[PDB]
Amino acid sequence: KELVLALYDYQEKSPREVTMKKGDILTLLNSTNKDWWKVEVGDRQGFVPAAYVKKLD
């Protein structure tokens, strides 16, 4: 889908989560949830706080 920019670093805390580093460019996979967005960071998928990323589009 679209691309989002990681505004903050985020280390996963649950099995469904994924780690990211500020500055990273992730592929937005599912933004149906207002609190967690499924993204692809590098070569891995998972959820990160919707609030910590920004849509570029």
Series of H and E elements = EEEEE
Proportion of residues in extended strands: 35-45%
Number of helices: 0
Give the N-to-C terminal Cα separation: 9 Å
The CATH architecture name reads Roll
Instruction: Supply the CATH superfamily name.
Output: SH3 Domains
State the CATH class. Mainly Beta
Question: Rg to the nearest angstrom?
Answer: 10 Å
Q: How many distinct beta strands?
A: 5
Strand order of the largest sheet: 4-3-2-1-5
Which structural class is indicated by helix and strand composition?
Answer: mainly beta
Count the domains: 1
Helix content: under 10%
Largest sheet: 5 strands, antiparallel
Family: Belongs to the spectrin family.
Subunit structure: Like erythrocyte spectrin, the spectrin-like proteins are capable of forming dimers which can further associate to tetramers. Interacts with ACP1.
Domain SH3: 1-57
Protein name: Spectrin alpha chain, non-erythrocytic 1
Architecture overview:
With 57 residues, the protein is mainly beta. The chain has a single domain (1-57), classed as SH3 Domains (SH3 type barrels), CATH 2.30.30.40. The chain contains no helices and five strands. A five-stranded antiparallel sheet has the order 4-3-2-1-5, with no helix packed on it. It is globular and about 30 Å long. It comes from Gallus gallus. This is Spectrin alpha chain, non-erythrocytic 1. Residues 1-57 form the SH3 domain. Like erythrocyte spectrin, the spectrin-like proteins are capable of forming dimers which can further associate to tetramers. Interacts with ACP1.
